[PDB]
Write a protein that binds this ligand. Sequence first.
Ligand SMILES: O=C(O)C[C@H](c1ccc2c(c1)OCO2)c1ccc2ccc(OCC(=O)N[C@H]3C=CCCC3)cc2c1
Ligand SMILES: [Cl-]
Ligand SMILES: [Cl-]
Length: 291
Amino acid sequence: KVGRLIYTAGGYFRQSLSYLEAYNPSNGSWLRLADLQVPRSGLAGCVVGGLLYAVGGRNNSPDGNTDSSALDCYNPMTNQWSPCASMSVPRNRIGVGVIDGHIYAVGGSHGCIHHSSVERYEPERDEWHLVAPMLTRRIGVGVAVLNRLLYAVGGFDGTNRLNSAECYYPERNEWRMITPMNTIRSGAGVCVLHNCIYAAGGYDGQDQLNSVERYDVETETWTFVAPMRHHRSALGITVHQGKIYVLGGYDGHTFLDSVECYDPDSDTWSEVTRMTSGRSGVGVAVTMEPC
Ligand SMILES: O=C(O)C[C@H](c1ccc2c(c1)OCO2)c1ccc2ccc(OCC(=O)N[C@H]3C=CCCC3)cc2c1
Ligand SMILES: [Cl-]
Ligand SMILES: [Cl-]
């Protein structure tokens, strides 16, 4: 369990960013690591086999906006990024989840297209293949995996921001709606802790949110927990040693540098550190410290 860091890749502040930085909860330190080859915001991060993957996003620059179909892998042992096979389609504001060593890329946008499509990456073959599409088009979708089922939560379908959510059952290659959230949320942070799917923050179409709700997969209910200290949309999120960490985002005024940590035992959020600069739209995941 020891020696794992929270990695934050990419993001947005004025333009899309190439930063890869890693935070050590055990000593409070931050490390700046190898930049992404292409700056991206609206990407997702995940880890398989100790390698960190950056999936999708968009490169916003003064010279334009390019939605990304890229999959790039970072090896902490070498501090190097390598390109992997690209997805079938660019996906900005994507959601990803990992089941049994396979990466699922969910939704996202390509220009004015809002995807319902979903595709699955096999690291051992370096190949993507499409799977069944969601029942709803969703960008800014939160994705998490619990008990080898994949959940897609909230987002924006091109017309309305969503409180709906759905679950993918891999052995039937089928999506089914689940109970909708109590709040409309696009760009929320979605993760799994214990037997629940948490949805933190986001934008309800009117304001950035500090509220947080969790879906108990057994009872099929959404319940609010303690709100974050800060309203945040387009936040990064991950879980580490039994606590949720939320990183950055936009509060309606500032791009936040604050990182908050949720303790489910006390139902409290605490501010634990600050990123090196404020940003939104980052990809976040946990793996071993680099060499
Ligand atoms: O609901 C919508 O229509 C789209 C929705 C959104 C959310 C909150 C908003 C909002 C728009 O408008 C002001 O608050 C969204 C959802 C997830 C994202 C993930 C990543 C991402 O990456 C780039 C990025 O961070 N851009 C930011 C620039 C300035 C502030 C907004 C975002 C942008 C995302 C945007
Ligand atoms: Cl964007
Ligand atoms: Cl992961």
